[PDB]
From Swiss-Prot:
The modification N6-acetyllysine is found at residues 41, 63, 77, 114. This is Rho GDP-dissociation inhibitor 1. It is found in: Cytoplasm. The modification N6-succinyllysine is found at residue 77. The keyword Plastid does not apply. Monomer. Interacts with FER. Interacts with PLXNB3. Forms a heterodimer with RAC1. Interacts with RHOA, the affinity is increased by three orders of magnitude when RHOA is prenylated. Interacts with PSMD10; the interaction increases ARHGDIA association with RHOA, leading to ARHGDIA-mediated inactivation of RHOA and ROCK and prolonged AKT activation. Interacts with KANK2; the interaction is direct and may regulate the interaction of ARHGDIA with RHOA, RAC1 and CDC42. Interacts with RHOC. Interacts with CDC42. Interacts with NGFR (via death domain); NGFR binding decreases the affinity for RHOA. One of its GO terms (molecular function) is Rho GDP-dissociation inhibitor activity. Keywords: Acetylation, Cytoplasm, Disease variant, GTPase activation, Isopeptide bond, Phosphoprotein, Ubl conjugation. The chain holds residues 67 to 202 of 204 of the full protein. It comes from Homo sapiens. Controls Rho proteins homeostasis. Regulates the GDP/GTP exchange reaction of the Rho proteins by inhibiting the dissociation of GDP from them, and the subsequent binding of GTP to them. Retains Rho proteins such as CDC42, RAC1 and RHOA in an inactive cytosolic pool, regulating their stability and protecting them from degradation. Actively involved in the recycling and distribution of activated Rho GTPases in the cell, mediates extraction from membranes of both inactive and activated molecules due its exceptionally high affinity for prenylated forms. It is linked to Nephrotic syndrome 8: A form of nephrotic syndrome, a renal disease clinically characterized by progressive renal failure, severe proteinuria, hypoalbuminemia, hyperlipidemia and edema. Kidney biopsies show diffuse mesangial sclerosis, with small glomeruli, hypercellularity, increased extracellular matrix, and contracted/collapsed glomerular tufts surrounded by immature or abnormal podocytes. One of its GO terms (biological process) is regulation of Rho protein signal transduction.
Length: 138
């Protein structure tokens, strides 16, 4: 015990051509992700899937935010409106629109992402950091 009202449980990169799963278990030690990375082949299409649970009461204005950094320098910020969710037994899944990984030699390499899941009360449901490595091939 106990069970919070909102629990963010997973991040998944959904990519048909990836040879293996690309998932972060957000119920564990989030610090471990900083020394790990997901590899994506340059230019491939993918979505980001955020999995979460609502256990007791409605939460309005859920929002997913990603800040992308390159060698510690912020290069992009994207906010995604997730919406209002009530409680249920099954996990909820939020999928971002389809995006393409960067492509071309100058754009390959390592990127870090600072992710935040929040709501209209500005609740820090979860904050975590993870890495993407863009390569010529899988």
């Amino acid at each position: 015990a106990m069970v919070p009202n909102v629990v963010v449980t997973g991040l998944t990169l959904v990519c048909s051509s990836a040879p293996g799963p690309l998932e972060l278990d957000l119920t564990g030690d989030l610090e471990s992700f900083k020394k790990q990375s997901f590899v994506l082949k340059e230019g491939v299409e993918y979505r980001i899937k955020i999995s979460f649970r609502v256990n007791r009461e409605i939460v309005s204005g859920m929002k997913y935010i990603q800040h992308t950094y390159r060698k510690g320098v912020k290069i992009d910020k994207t906010d995604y409106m997730v919406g209002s969710y009530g409680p249920r037994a099954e996990h909820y899944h939020f999928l971002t629109p389809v995006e393409e990984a960067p492509k071309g030699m100058l754009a390959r390499g390592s990127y870090s992402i600072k992710s935040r899941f929040t709501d209209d009360d500005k609740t820090d449901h979860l904050s975590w950091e993870w890495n993407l490595t863009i390569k010529k091939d899988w």
